[PDB]
Symmetry: C2
Subunit: 104 residues, 2 copies
């Protein structure tokens, strides 16, 4: 098997790695990191100047063996609106970002 | 001090408690529960027949002592669009739901 990664996923993952890669979970710093991830991934989207509203959410979980499950549902225009979720991890943390684009 | 809980937060929290209250984290069942929470909270919003697109996200984390941080950022119309986040927990799990409404 083989695969080529779509552009949105690749550029979101890069924004995460740039923002937090090389770092170990530190409770007092992570709220600022999580805010930086969302802001840098929103900038990934808005620099393209496309006619959409965007929502970007991110979560950073310390790695400790806990189970975690996420899901989303939307009421929108399925012909034009969409979302992408990316998961990223290192030895001490998992970071999941989801972006949603809604045509205006 | 005192407070009165806004209607959206109260009705989202009730949808979570109805969906998962009384239950203990069980790995194989939680993906379905998380999907049920999002669907029941989206129904909370869409039954009001208002002129908005909605995004509902939910996360269920097993309680194990792990740190967790979440954040969101949006590019939208600040005069009309908005969001609410609710956190809920019992002895074995935390469930966080965020809803975002974007005027059409």
């Amino acid at each position: 098997s083989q695969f080529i990664v779509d552009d949105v996923s690749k550029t979101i993952k890069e924004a995460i790695e740039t923002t937090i890669g090389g770092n170990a979970y530190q409770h007092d710093k992570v709220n600022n990191w999580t805010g930086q991830v969302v802001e840098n991934c929103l900038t990934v989207l808005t620099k393209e100047q496309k006619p959409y509203k965007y929502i970007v959410t991110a979560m950073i979980m310390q790695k400790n063996g806990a189970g975690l499950h996420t899901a989303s549902s939307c009421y929108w225009n399925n012909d034009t609106d969409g979302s992408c979720t990316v998961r990223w991890e290192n030895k001490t943390m998992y970071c999941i970002v989801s972006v949603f684009g809604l045509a205006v």
